[PDB]
Design an enzyme around this catalytic site. Sequence first.
Site, PDB file in Angstrom:
ATOM      1  N   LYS A 276       0.809  -1.220   0.000  1.00  0.00           N
ATOM      2  CA  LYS A 276       0.000   0.000   0.000  1.00  0.00           C
ATOM      3  C   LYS A 276       0.848   1.279   0.000  1.00  0.00           C
ATOM      4  O   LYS A 276       1.777   1.327   0.740  1.00  0.00           O
ATOM      5  CB  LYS A 276      -0.913   0.025   1.241  1.00  0.00           C
ATOM      6  CG  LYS A 276      -1.822   1.269   1.406  1.00  0.00           C
ATOM      7  CD  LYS A 276      -2.966   1.473   0.410  1.00  0.00           C
ATOM      8  CE  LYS A 276      -3.489   2.911   0.372  1.00  0.00           C
ATOM      9  NZ  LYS A 276      -4.575   3.345  -0.677  1.00  0.00           N
TER      10      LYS A 276
ATOM     11  N   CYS B 151       0.198  12.375  -5.903  1.00  0.00           N
ATOM     12  CA  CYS B 151       0.210  12.848  -4.533  1.00  0.00           C
ATOM     13  C   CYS B 151      -0.137  14.350  -4.533  1.00  0.00           C
ATOM     14  O   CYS B 151      -0.286  14.964  -5.617  1.00  0.00           O
ATOM     15  CB  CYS B 151       1.569  12.502  -3.908  1.00  0.00           C
ATOM     16  SG  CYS B 151       2.971  12.965  -4.967  1.00  0.00           S
TER      17      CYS B 151
ATOM     18  N   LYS C  33       4.608   5.568 -10.401  1.00  0.00           N
ATOM     19  CA  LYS C  33       3.212   5.285 -10.728  1.00  0.00           C
ATOM     20  C   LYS C  33       2.581   6.585 -11.257  1.00  0.00           C
ATOM     21  O   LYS C  33       2.557   7.627 -10.575  1.00  0.00           O
ATOM     22  CB  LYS C  33       2.480   4.777  -9.484  1.00  0.00           C
ATOM     23  CG  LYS C  33       0.988   4.461  -9.587  1.00  0.00           C
ATOM     24  CD  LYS C  33       0.782   3.209 -10.354  1.00  0.00           C
ATOM     25  CE  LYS C  33      -0.671   2.821 -10.391  1.00  0.00           C
ATOM     26  NZ  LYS C  33      -1.023   2.283  -9.092  1.00  0.00           N
TER      27      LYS C  33
ATOM     28  N   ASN D  57      -2.537   4.845 -12.879  1.00  0.00           N
ATOM     29  CA  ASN D  57      -3.426   5.033 -11.683  1.00  0.00           C
ATOM     30  C   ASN D  57      -4.920   5.178 -12.129  1.00  0.00           C
ATOM     31  O   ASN D  57      -5.239   5.242 -13.344  1.00  0.00           O
ATOM     32  CB  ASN D  57      -2.924   6.219 -10.855  1.00  0.00           C
ATOM     33  CG  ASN D  57      -3.183   6.048  -9.359  1.00  0.00           C
ATOM     34  OD1 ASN D  57      -4.277   5.663  -8.900  1.00  0.00           O
ATOM     35  ND2 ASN D  57      -2.195   6.369  -8.590  1.00  0.00           N
ATOM     36  N   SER D  58      -5.815   5.288 -11.193  1.00  0.00           N
ATOM     37  CA  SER D  58      -7.258   5.478 -11.513  1.00  0.00           C
ATOM     38  C   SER D  58      -7.537   6.731 -12.345  1.00  0.00           C
ATOM     39  O   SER D  58      -6.765   7.742 -12.301  1.00  0.00           O
ATOM     40  CB  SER D  58      -8.090   5.457 -10.172  1.00  0.00           C
ATOM     41  OG  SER D  58      -7.677   6.435  -9.283  1.00  0.00           O
TER      42      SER D  58
HETATM   43  C1  LIG Z   1      -9.396   0.661  -3.313  1.00  0.00           C
HETATM   44  C2  LIG Z   1      -8.224   1.195  -4.107  1.00  0.00           C
HETATM   45  C3  LIG Z   1      -7.067   1.708  -3.502  1.00  0.00           C
HETATM   46  C4  LIG Z   1      -5.965   2.176  -4.227  1.00  0.00           C
HETATM   47  N1  LIG Z   1      -4.867   2.784  -3.661  1.00  0.00           N
HETATM   48  C5  LIG Z   1      -3.779   3.075  -4.416  1.00  0.00           C
HETATM   49  C6  LIG Z   1      -2.506   3.434  -3.785  1.00  0.00           C
HETATM   50  O1  LIG Z   1      -2.507   3.412  -2.504  1.00  0.00           O
HETATM   51  N2  LIG Z   1      -1.564   3.737  -4.588  1.00  0.00           N
HETATM   52  C7  LIG Z   1      -1.646   3.677  -5.916  1.00  0.00           C
HETATM   53  O2  LIG Z   1      -0.619   3.889  -6.614  1.00  0.00           O
HETATM   54  N3  LIG Z   1      -2.788   3.368  -6.597  1.00  0.00           N
HETATM   55  C8  LIG Z   1      -3.822   2.959  -5.855  1.00  0.00           C
HETATM   56  N4  LIG Z   1      -5.008   2.581  -6.427  1.00  0.00           N
HETATM   57  C9  LIG Z   1      -5.029   2.542  -7.891  1.00  0.00           C
HETATM   58  C10 LIG Z   1      -4.710   1.170  -8.494  1.00  0.00           C
HETATM   59  O3  LIG Z   1      -3.365   0.835  -8.107  1.00  0.00           O
HETATM   60  C11 LIG Z   1      -4.891   1.144  -9.984  1.00  0.00           C
HETATM   61  O4  LIG Z   1      -3.936   2.054 -10.567  1.00  0.00           O
HETATM   62  C12 LIG Z   1      -6.297   1.444 -10.483  1.00  0.00           C
HETATM   63  O5  LIG Z   1      -7.288   0.830  -9.615  1.00  0.00           O
HETATM   64  C13 LIG Z   1      -6.495   1.062 -11.945  1.00  0.00           C
HETATM   65  O6  LIG Z   1      -6.359  -0.345 -12.059  1.00  0.00           O
HETATM   66  P1  LIG Z   1      -7.657  -1.364 -12.167  1.00  0.00           P
HETATM   67  O7  LIG Z   1      -8.441  -0.931 -13.371  1.00  0.00           O
HETATM   68  O8  LIG Z   1      -7.187  -2.735 -12.211  1.00  0.00           O
HETATM   69  O9  LIG Z   1      -8.445  -1.106 -10.900  1.00  0.00           O
HETATM   70  C14 LIG Z   1      -6.032   2.101  -5.684  1.00  0.00           C
HETATM   71  C15 LIG Z   1      -7.182   1.588  -6.320  1.00  0.00           C
HETATM   72  C16 LIG Z   1      -8.270   1.121  -5.584  1.00  0.00           C
HETATM   73  C17 LIG Z   1      -9.448   0.607  -6.359  1.00  0.00           C
HETATM   74  O1  LIG Z   2      -5.970   6.228  -1.424  1.00  0.00           O
HETATM   75  C1  LIG Z   2      -6.540   6.689  -2.450  1.00  0.00           C
HETATM   76  O2  LIG Z   2      -7.620   7.326  -2.345  1.00  0.00           O
HETATM   77  C2  LIG Z   2      -5.934   6.484  -3.743  1.00  0.00           C
HETATM   78  N1  LIG Z   2      -6.815   5.897  -4.728  1.00  0.00           N
HETATM   79  C3  LIG Z   2      -6.410   5.633  -6.024  1.00  0.00           C
HETATM   80  O3  LIG Z   2      -7.231   5.210  -6.874  1.00  0.00           O
HETATM   81  N2  LIG Z   2      -5.098   5.959  -6.317  1.00  0.00           N
HETATM   82  C4  LIG Z   2      -4.183   6.521  -5.411  1.00  0.00           C
HETATM   83  O4  LIG Z   2      -3.068   6.767  -5.843  1.00  0.00           O
HETATM   84  C5  LIG Z   2      -4.600   6.804  -4.077  1.00  0.00           C
HETATM   85  C6  LIG Z   2      -3.662   7.444  -3.130  1.00  0.00           C
HETATM   86  C7  LIG Z   2      -3.416   8.884  -3.646  1.00  0.00           C
HETATM   87  C8  LIG Z   2      -4.231   9.745  -2.814  1.00  0.00           C
HETATM   88  C9  LIG Z   2      -5.584   9.909  -3.072  1.00  0.00           C
HETATM   89  C10 LIG Z   2      -6.467  10.657  -2.249  1.00  0.00           C
HETATM   90  C11 LIG Z   2      -7.810  10.810  -2.649  1.00  0.00           C
HETATM   91  C12 LIG Z   2      -8.716  11.548  -1.875  1.00  0.00           C
HETATM   92  C13 LIG Z   2      -8.230  12.158  -0.707  1.00  0.00           C
HETATM   93  C14 LIG Z   2      -6.890  12.036  -0.344  1.00  0.00           C
HETATM   94  C15 LIG Z   2      -6.019  11.297  -1.124  1.00  0.00           C
HETATM   95  C16 LIG Z   2      -4.672  11.139  -0.811  1.00  0.00           C
HETATM   96  C17 LIG Z   2      -4.205  11.724   0.356  1.00  0.00           C
HETATM   97  C18 LIG Z   2      -2.877  11.588   0.676  1.00  0.00           C
HETATM   98  C19 LIG Z   2      -1.995  10.833  -0.111  1.00  0.00           C
HETATM   99  C20 LIG Z   2      -2.440  10.231  -1.278  1.00  0.00           C
HETATM  100  C21 LIG Z   2      -3.799  10.356  -1.635  1.00  0.00           C
END
Ligand SMILES: Cc1cc2nc3c(=O)[nH]c(=O)nc-3n(C[C@H](O)[C@H](O)[C@H](O)COP(=O)(O)O)c2cc1C
Ligand SMILES: O=C(O)c1[nH]c(=O)[nH]c(=O)c1CCc1cc2ccccc2c2ccccc12
Lengths: 313, 313
Positions: free
Chosen positions: B44, B131, B165, B195-196
């Site tokens: 994570k 970020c 990323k 990423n998303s």
């Molecule tokens: C519940 C959730 C939490 C995530 N947290 C992170 C994260 O902490 N760091 C990050 O680089 N991307 C995070 N993502 C993004 C995923 O790593 C990924 O880039 C994104 O979901 C697109 O891939 P997918 O279509 O397979 O879901 C998160 C996605 C989801 C759905």
């Molecule tokens: O943790 C997430 O929400 C998140 N979800 C994703 O789909 N991709 C991501 O990369 C992340 C983490 C990036 C991020 C996503 C955030 C989205 C809403 C509010 C706060 C944050 C945040 C706060 C501090 C540090 C990072 C975040």
Amino acid sequence: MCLKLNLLDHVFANPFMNAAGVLCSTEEDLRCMTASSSGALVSKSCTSAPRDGNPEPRYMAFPLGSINSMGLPNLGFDFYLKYASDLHDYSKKPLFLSISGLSVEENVAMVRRLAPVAQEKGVLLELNLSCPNVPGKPQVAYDFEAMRTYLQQVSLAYGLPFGVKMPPYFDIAHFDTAAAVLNEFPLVKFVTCVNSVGNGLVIDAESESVVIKPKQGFGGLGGKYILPTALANVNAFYRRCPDKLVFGCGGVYSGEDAFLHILAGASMVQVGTALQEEGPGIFTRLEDELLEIMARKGYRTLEEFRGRVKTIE
Amino acid sequence: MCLKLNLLDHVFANPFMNAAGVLCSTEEDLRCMTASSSGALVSKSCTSAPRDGNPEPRYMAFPLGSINSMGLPNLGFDFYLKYASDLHDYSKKPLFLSISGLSVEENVAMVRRLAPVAQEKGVLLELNLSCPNVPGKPQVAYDFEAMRTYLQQVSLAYGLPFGVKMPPYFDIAHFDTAAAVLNEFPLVKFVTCVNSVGNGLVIDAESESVVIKPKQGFGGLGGKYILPTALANVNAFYRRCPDKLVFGCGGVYSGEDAFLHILAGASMVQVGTALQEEGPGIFTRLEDELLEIMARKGYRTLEEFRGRVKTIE
Ligand SMILES: Cc1cc2nc3c(=O)[nH]c(=O)nc-3n(C[C@H](O)[C@H](O)[C@H](O)COP(=O)(O)O)c2cc1C
Ligand SMILES: O=C(O)c1[nH]c(=O)[nH]c(=O)c1CCc1cc2ccccc2c2ccccc12
Ligand SMILES: Cc1cc2nc3c(=O)[nH]c(=O)nc-3n(C[C@H](O)[C@H](O)[C@H](O)COP(=O)(O)O)c2cc1C
Ligand SMILES: O=C(O)c1[nH]c(=O)[nH]c(=O)c1CCc1cc2ccccc2c2ccccc12
């Protein structure tokens, strides 16, 4: 129970219309959209001169939506202006005319000439900002200084209410900045959210090949892929532009998708990919489906739920 | 036929891993990913201090994908460092550690402490450039000047090979600018696309409400909605970064989808939404399905087709 709207000094039987670029390039297309149950129509985004567009294949569709790099094929402004001034039957429904000049000067030249026709016949302008600037720079609506320039010059040259077609944004700071730019222009009375999600890439696993020829297979995405993006944009601008209308575009295939757009803040609801795929009979279906949702929920008019999406706590 | 590969001075049984943020927050999650058939795992994204994240509901999935505004809930850097240093079994598979500090100073602080663990144990760093940024500014990866600063400072502070990323881009000029920044940094050896898709909005028709609590329902999209966007970003960076590896992420639910990521240029393939929905058994299905497509096509290695997507004419 009724789908009627009255806006921008026109009356609309229902909120449905084609998305620019779909079923609106030729006189035949425009006559077909006029004959349909749609509440309005928009003509293909045009340039001053006619354009052949990009090489084919340049549009493909699939279960979850479409990809295109059409390259703005169109019959030229003179043709669309003639359709607006001499051919369109305004007793059927209202007409929007979309423009997408390759420079600020080209757009200025077209809006100068549209103005008298707009005043006399009531055609409505949609300026496409989701469109080429200098090559190597982002499209105009992703360059907020160029967007401001474009709107200043078109406002001055046109002098009448118009609207704008916007690409999607993905960052809250962009929603904030873009709405602020638009809010500097009181003649911008509607904002259409959204154009295609840019530079996607569809690959066919069997052939191991991209599916469109231009730009190495890269092109704009529409359809089911883009509904939540479209809803976010509609709502973002609805909340940020309280003196403007928002029209919704993206991912509409059913009356329930149109319902969600309207809940997000949409006044008019445009239909691109689904219309390309199904044809103009979609408009009767969408109307019936939306009315059915309204009857189940007890809503009698669109204004009773437009923009009333609920948030949690 | 096996899918074994070597990258970044490590050996991998297969190209599959979790996406950062899915099944990787707690010691239990990390042990479950280690026990899976994935080729690698990523922890994570973390901050220096533990975070509770945003109010629930903060994640929702649907047939077409997912929406999240998790708010970076995590156990804190000290925990993931300890996992990398003392608890992870490197004989089972390689480990990536994702950091997402709230400022450049925070990231520098974590990477200086990570460096000796990376040297001794071989843990790989993934820097999350989605970020937060300075007042009125977009996320870091959408502010190319901030991106360059972050990468200059982490490179200097860490001194070892790492990856980044990235969020999706939607404009060719942005692909050109972003790739040119990354190419300034020889220690950036992999780029993970994507990423998303930021700030989509899902609305439930029955309840007329958004489906997540934070940010008025706005959140990042994953799953089927984003596959063509992910393929485009993978291929754009694959083309523009010939001295780096590209890791693909977005929309993988099947071996066919993985095949498409690899054709586009992906060395490793990450699974987010589909893993959250199906659980870690997905990894054996994906491997089987990828091997089956390879067999039907006559491919014996990944190298035979990686990045070999065909264009038209
Ligand atoms: C519940 C959730 C939490 C995530 N947290 C992170 C994260 O902490 N760091 C990050 O680089 N991307 C995070 N993502 C993004 C995923 O790593 C990924 O880039 C994104 O979901 C697109 O891939 P997918 O279509 O397979 O879901 C998160 C996605 C989801 C759905
Ligand atoms: O943790 C997430 O929400 C998140 N979800 C994703 O789909 N991709 C991501 O990369 C992340 C983490 C990036 C991020 C996503 C955030 C989205 C809403 C509010 C706060 C944050 C945040 C706060 C501090 C540090 C990072 C975040
Ligand atoms: C073949 C095709 C041509 C298009 N041409 C235009 C155009 O000329 N002007 C414009 O504003 N939008 C154009 N678009 C974008 C649509 O108007 C619409 O914004 C996009 O397709 C999203 O809606 P949908 O999900 O219903 O397809 C075009 C879309 C397609 C598929
Ligand atoms: O014609 C289009 O490709 C197009 N497709 C969409 O999905 N939305 C649009 O707004 C447009 C038109 C904008 C546009 C889009 C283009 C996309 C790729 C290559 C060329 C163009 C172009 C060239 C001249 C004038 C306009 C364009």
